Amino acid sequence: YAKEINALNNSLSDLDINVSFEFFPPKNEQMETMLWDSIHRLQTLHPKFVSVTYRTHGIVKRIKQETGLEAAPHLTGIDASPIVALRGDEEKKPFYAEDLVKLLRSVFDISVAAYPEVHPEAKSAQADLINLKRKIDAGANHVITQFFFDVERYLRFRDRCVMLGIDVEIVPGILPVTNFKQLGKMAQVTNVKIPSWLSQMYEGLDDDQGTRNLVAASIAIDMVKVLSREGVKDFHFYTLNRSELTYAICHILGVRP
Amino acid sequence: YAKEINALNNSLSDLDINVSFEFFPPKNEQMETMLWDSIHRLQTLHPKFVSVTYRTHGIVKRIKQETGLEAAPHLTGIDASPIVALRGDEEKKPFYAEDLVKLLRSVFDISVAAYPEVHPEAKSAQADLINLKRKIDAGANHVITQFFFDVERYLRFRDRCVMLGIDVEIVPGILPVTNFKQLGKMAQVTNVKIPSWLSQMYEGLDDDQGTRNLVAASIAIDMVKVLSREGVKDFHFYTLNRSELTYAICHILGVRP
Amino acid sequence: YAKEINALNNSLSDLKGDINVSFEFFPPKNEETMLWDSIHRLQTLHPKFVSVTYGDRTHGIVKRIKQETGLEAAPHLSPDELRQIAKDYWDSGIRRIVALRGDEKPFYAEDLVKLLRSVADFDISVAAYPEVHPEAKSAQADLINLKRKIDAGANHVITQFFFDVERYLRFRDRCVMLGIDVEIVPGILPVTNFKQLGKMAQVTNVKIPSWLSQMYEGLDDDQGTRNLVAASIAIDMVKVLSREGVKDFHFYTLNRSELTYAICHILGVRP
Amino acid sequence: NYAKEINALNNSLSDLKGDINVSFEFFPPKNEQMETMLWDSIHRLQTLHPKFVSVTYGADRTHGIVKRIKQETGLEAAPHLTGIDASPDELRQIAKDYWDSGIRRIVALRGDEPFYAEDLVKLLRSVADFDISVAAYPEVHPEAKSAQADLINLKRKIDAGANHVITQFFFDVERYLRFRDRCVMLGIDVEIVPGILPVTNFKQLGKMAQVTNVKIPSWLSQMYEGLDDDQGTRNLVAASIAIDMVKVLSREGVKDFHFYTLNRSELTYAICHILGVRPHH
Amino acid sequence: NYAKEINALNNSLSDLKGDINVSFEFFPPKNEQMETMLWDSIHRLQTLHPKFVSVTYGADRTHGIVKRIKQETGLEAAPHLTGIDASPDELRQIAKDYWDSGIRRIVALRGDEPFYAEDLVKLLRSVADFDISVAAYPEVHPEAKSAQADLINLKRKIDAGANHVITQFFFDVERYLRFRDRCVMLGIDVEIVPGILPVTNFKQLGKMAQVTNVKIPSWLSQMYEGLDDDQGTRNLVAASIAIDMVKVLSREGVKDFHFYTLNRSELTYAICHILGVRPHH
Amino acid sequence: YAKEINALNNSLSDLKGDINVSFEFFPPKNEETMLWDSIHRLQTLHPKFVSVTYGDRTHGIVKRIKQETGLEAAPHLSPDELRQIAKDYWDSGIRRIVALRGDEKPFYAEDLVKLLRSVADFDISVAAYPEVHPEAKSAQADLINLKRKIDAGANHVITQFFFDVERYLRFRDRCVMLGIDVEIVPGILPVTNFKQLGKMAQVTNVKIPSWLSQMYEGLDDDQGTRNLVAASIAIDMVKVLSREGVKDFHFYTLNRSELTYAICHILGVRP
Ligand SMILES: Cc1cc2nc3c(=O)[nH]c(=O)nc-3n(C[C@H](O)[C@H](O)[C@H](O)COP(=O)(O)OP(=O)(O)OC[C@H]3O[C@@H](n4cnc5c(N)ncnc54)[C@H](O)[C@@H]3O)c2cc1C
Ligand SMILES: Cc1cc2nc3c(=O)[nH]c(=O)nc-3n(C[C@H](O)[C@H](O)[C@H](O)COP(=O)(O)OP(=O)(O)OC[C@H]3O[C@@H](n4cnc5c(N)ncnc54)[C@H](O)[C@@H]3O)c2cc1C
Ligand SMILES: Cc1cc2nc3c(=O)[nH]c(=O)nc-3n(C[C@H](O)[C@H](O)[C@H](O)COP(=O)(O)OP(=O)(O)OC[C@H]3O[C@@H](n4cnc5c(N)ncnc54)[C@H](O)[C@@H]3O)c2cc1C
Ligand SMILES: Cc1cc2nc3c(=O)[nH]c(=O)nc-3n(C[C@H](O)[C@H](O)[C@H](O)COP(=O)(O)OP(=O)(O)OC[C@H]3O[C@@H](n4cnc5c(N)ncnc54)[C@H](O)[C@@H]3O)c2cc1C
Ligand SMILES: Cc1cc2nc3c(=O)[nH]c(=O)nc-3n(C[C@H](O)[C@H](O)[C@H](O)COP(=O)(O)OP(=O)(O)OC[C@H]3O[C@@H](n4cnc5c(N)ncnc54)[C@H](O)[C@@H]3O)c2cc1C
């Protein structure tokens, strides 16, 4: 094991990496104060793009103008009719994200969502993979995964994508665990299995964010180190409008100002 | 590699661990303010003992009384004549740490220093290992290593100790890298090889301690995870009178209040 | 290698309860004692459905299960004669039928899916052959035939039993490469009688691995040890299959319940 | 690539034959219904021609069973010898009494006290030329001064005359392999024979592991919860767990196995069959 | 346990024989002193009876050399074919001209442009039934849309008729093994033949690796700094680096090797000798 | 296995400049050309010392090196006759002598260390045999004899050449277990002539590994490839030895300089 970790470390200095940050429209102004403080410091990393959770039309323009980074908004299909194209979390009369990419393309660089542990509403794992292919075959050119913690399940899913012919990279979505109680709620609606070892690390830390920040680094740094070794040069961080972790992770990948 | 990190994580929840902290006599009162704030929070971990760098006679008593934790002072042989027994960093007329253990035993639980990468003044690696055996054969019962970053070199040194007959555990000394410039100066006087990958991680971080705290966690957490897997149940932290890292590391080992 | 099994074992608590199972029985020849006893022990597992092979009248077995057990039952299967059989099955409460060509002017499973769909909105299960059906002209033809079976109205794929998990995983990959949007449910046959398996495998063209034959030589009279060896093999297969994304399983119980019950328990399938 | 790894793990079993030594361990039957189970298990397991069988010793039921085993089956039977019960003079008499009855192997142990085994091994060797099997603890004995000291103690027990090593049962195979690699580093020329305990009972295992300091993995508990009344399923689960271990162990070059039968034969017989240890081989 | 691992790595070389295929790569000699070095290298390497030798093509010197090789040595010589220089009509004529001269293998490549190879492979197959060797990039080609796309492109080149794959040279063996494992996942039935470039010159290597996007490890630079004037020591260092790779590669089941000789024979001859490819075997 | 070499390679930049080397030559038989050429190429490496074997008068070789090169030189070696030889060596500027018993009323190296210490405060190098000197009654006796050699006044241990690194590392471990406080410096012999080695190894009882013989079969006329194969072997040994703590090396140059120079360069030993 000592040889494995040392091997992981010396192969990371042999790095050309693209990053992309994700923020969410704040609830209060204290959250909007914490966001722009994080938005100002993150701009120094020169990311490939940023994203806006889904109202949020006044963020893709503001970020594009108050700053100089390329912004892209999320867009669902809830309550509308005939560029992160999502179906959304629904109600009557649904259409699938593919229909949105087909529609939006008529008007762009489309980003779709991928689920290595299968979307909860998918009829099967085979159907959920075919749906991602036709989403790209509809006009998308950037694939972003839902957050995960079994890196193996990601690598097998990534291997099945090239097997189907998907020629675009399956960008892993990195979620640093800065609030475990929040993750549990997020995981309830995302059907992503939380490993047993991750929960054991965070019991008794519901009030010490500083230690949570330190423990979250080790988990996210380990994942990114393993992902980088296998050829992954694209990353998309779910910052949760915080910047301490996403900044430190990117620094390990050589992403520095 | 994904299987290796996941294997490292599930085997850590299968833990009975002893810890020991080390502090140094402050230079100013701002440092003494930061020390006792760290001394108050660290006491909750119930460590096996604490140590005091080498004046420092008014710390083993104060810590023992103002708090409830067992304190042990460092003691060199510089400028004296006929319980962390050290020879010290010298001048004329030297005696070796063994002579101190032989003397002090006449008056205790003695802790000696071990060097997996060999003490710089040792005639050879074989001599430096024999000297550690006779130090224990003189009456010591606790071995603490100088800080290291090649965990393999520690494991081979630990394997050579039982080969010589040393029946006491070789407690690894964990130094979380919270100030890389300080480490470089410490490493100049300690002859400990700093791995090339560690220096690459910390370039450009001479003013961002927060990211240094996050990166220091991943390195120290990785080491401790590998050390724990091989049977190590004893740890000695060089806190440098800081508590953010040592607290977070111990928490990963189950050491919690 | 030591880390591989430990990794395979820790993947079962990261599965919660997402595994679907389906049991298969056959109409008995003599006094039926092991058949009805095994349905009682399995009924607690809440399977997606159970099935009964068709070779006499096996409607009086699908009927008892439908009421005596409360489990969804599905029976295996001239065009006009089948129209009444399918209509009689539907009006009895049967919602699923496993449409198969059979062994004995042929009527192929594709035509049957076309027929059953005309009778009612059935949930049809078709057979897939990862080691190729012995009569297929090629592996590509047998893969196309499975596509046409699903495109005719089928919505459930069950595999012939196998023991080379590699050959299954490659086959399952060729199905999604061809566009098959349904999961290829593996058919698990726990080896409780190697002599039966050797004869069964000779007529189905399924390869018996050399390591499997060595495990069972000299056990033609020790049923207890075969059950114990069958546990290791079936749990091993199910462990790797589950880790690689298979969450549906179809057990060929052969009217025995000890192995399927223990296998399901490893997958979290419990009462 | 698990499906390929499991297939090569099974092909390796057919890449070995005739070199697998096995040994079985029984305990003195308390009642008389257990007497029937033990001698049924002995008759089933004796067809495997093991290297020896051993009988545990609590606090002279053991000595009579070892005698009955050698006279009714011809197997080399080895009693376990506790030094905590008697004095160095009584132990020399027992050692002479054991040797004159045809006993050529003793499992020399310190004992479960509610004087160490290196002294007992030194004593036995002084009396006669037995083969002496000693205990190893890959997860470290619960009362050792340190993990370093417990490894030296085993080294001293070998230096004192012991020629056979049997480990406490384990369930993390990697920590056995780490332990065996450390024993080869110290120069212990004998092989560290892994003790295999088929988990036929989880509530009883929880008691043994409680006393023995052996770590029960999280996945093993999740496999047995709810099976406290189903012996048939517990055996099928145990057969998977034990066969997996011995397949992995046999891959890394382990050709010697010790089985904690708990007077039961069905599991040990099946595991030996997987290893190629069969009546006709 | 490195001393034991290095010993088993060397014992494995003596656990293989007669199955190792090797192929050598030369480039058109610019001057006339290089002409002597190439034909000296050819005469030394031809005794190894390689599967074929190949000649690179810059922007018809290549075609004449392939002709001289086949007529003076009898080796199957394979020219490299660039699609960036000519049009689809000229390429069909060259393909017919190549085939009528006895050429049965072409290294079909897109080319170094200051139209892709799948189209060139499709073209060649339409003309005649050559064996077509295509390029693989375990560290990904510098101009691919993604690592996913470069792997599909190689898959399409195989589907188009190519029956041989040669990799860009590498120095992290693990990333070649990862790449080969991914090619087996996609079902590419041919083996990914690793291209071995003995580092006889570090300044020249820095130029190739610069163009090729191949990552030069930190340890490899520390081995050559200061040797910019000592060819004798550079060869001894290169022999260690290349032999280590092919020993590791031969352990993982690689039985095919391609060598970037740079018209030099001393290194390739020694590496082949380690692999058991010798004049008398 | 791929990770093992990569780990071995990254351990050379974590070594900085802590390696000590020592070269060994022998008085030539004919026209001496390769001998003096090799001393010039090696002199830039700043070795701890060089040595010259003794079989004629080899003082006129230790003398030239002492002045023409500026390197610390050490010569190999009746009791009264040796007293003047040791006294003549000391007053010439020689501070180190490699005291050996020799091959041809014996005088053992132990007695020589006792003698040389009586002459002056010499730095004595003794020979160690990890595969046991062929005439030792046992491995324990040959290990005790090395202890008595050091306890008589020696302060430097040099090993006979070897190729089983395991047997060396175990031997080096038995030395410290016996109390030997000095490092057991491995003697590295790069195999530039296998035919010489096979004959050399027959009279010294050092085992030639089977893989080494296979690497050199058919190379009795190709010196260039032997040099290339010798590089791989010698660098491989030196790589693992350095990683496991050996920082002193003694090369048997055999009056050749290509291999030792390249080996030293891998260890950071550079001008
Ligand atoms: C990176 C990322 C960012 C996100 N941002 C937001 C955000 O800002 N706001 C928010 O509310 N949510 C957000 N989500 C959540 C996301 O909207 C949910 O995952 C949603 O329920 C599915 O979105 P989708 O675009 O992947 O849907 P789709 O791609 O349409 O997939 C959803 C399901 O539709 C099924 N499907 C598709 N076509 C068919 C068909 N013809 N027949 C049957 N089934 C079909 C597929 O099987 C699949 O299971 C985000 C998710 C990710 C990964
Ligand atoms: C955990 C830890 C805490 C420390 N705390 C402090 C502190 O508070 N203050 C401080 O100033 N320094 C401290 N140090 C540094 C320490 O004092 C230095 O490493 C010192 O130079 C050696 O100490 P020692 O006790 O290991 O010396 P020793 O154990 O005596 O070893 C020093 C050297 O003496 C040699 N030696 C021993 N006997 C003989 C002999 N008979 N002949 C020849 N050589 C011999 C050995 O080979 C060895 O190389 C600490 C070090 C550690 C690891
Ligand atoms: C899970 C399972 C359950 C089974 N249950 C039963 C049962 O209850 N009773 C029973 O008797 N048997 C049963 N069988 C066996 C099976 O039904 C027969 O043995 C038969 O050989 C295969 O059935 P099928 O429906 O898949 O045939 P099909 O897939 O319809 O046909 C088999 C062959 O015909 C070929 N084919 C298909 N269409 C054409 C065409 N147009 N032209 C030419 N060739 C064509 C296919 O390539 C294939 O090789 C079962 C098999 C499985 C796997
Ligand atoms: C295969 C096997 C069979 C067993 N059979 C029996 C049986 O029949 N009856 C029974 O009652 N129990 C039995 N036991 C239980 C066993 O005796 C207990 O584990 C006991 O507590 C230790 O026995 P030991 O011989 O291994 O002790 P030892 O290995 O001799 O030592 C016991 C402990 O003391 C430590 N120690 C050794 N020397 C010293 C010293 N000088 N100073 C301080 N500490 C020291 C050791 O490190 C170890 O932790 C068995 C155990 C095993 C694994
Ligand atoms: C063994 C070997 C021998 C060589 N010999 C020569 C030689 O003789 N002469 C010479 O000039 N060069 C030579 N080269 C250099 C080589 O031609 C260059 O690397 C070239 O840039 C790529 O060649 P290729 O055939 O691999 O291209 P391809 O693999 O066909 O493709 C080139 C790039 O374009 C991408 N691509 C493929 N299809 C598409 C598409 N539809 N849309 C967009 N991008 C696409 C691929 O992913 C790849 O990144 C050689 C290289 C190797 C490894």
Ligand SMILES: Cc1cc2nc3c(=O)[nH]c(=O)nc-3n(C[C@H](O)[C@H](O)[C@H](O)COP(=O)(O)OP(=O)(O)OC[C@H]3O[C@@H](n4cnc5c(N)ncnc54)[C@H](O)[C@@H]3O)c2cc1C
């Ligand atoms: C690095 C090196 C350099 C060498 N250089 C030379 C050289 O320049 N010239 C040359 O001629 N040879 C040389 N030799 C060879 C060596 O000197 C002889 O071949 C001799 O056989 C071994 O020498 P030694 O000093 O180690 O002998 P010793 O170690 O003194 O004796 C060899 C044997 O005697 C046994 N022995 C020692 N003391 C006693 C005792 N009291 N009673 C019984 N047995 C005893 C030992 O156990 C051992 O088996 C060299 C060898 C080495 C390894």
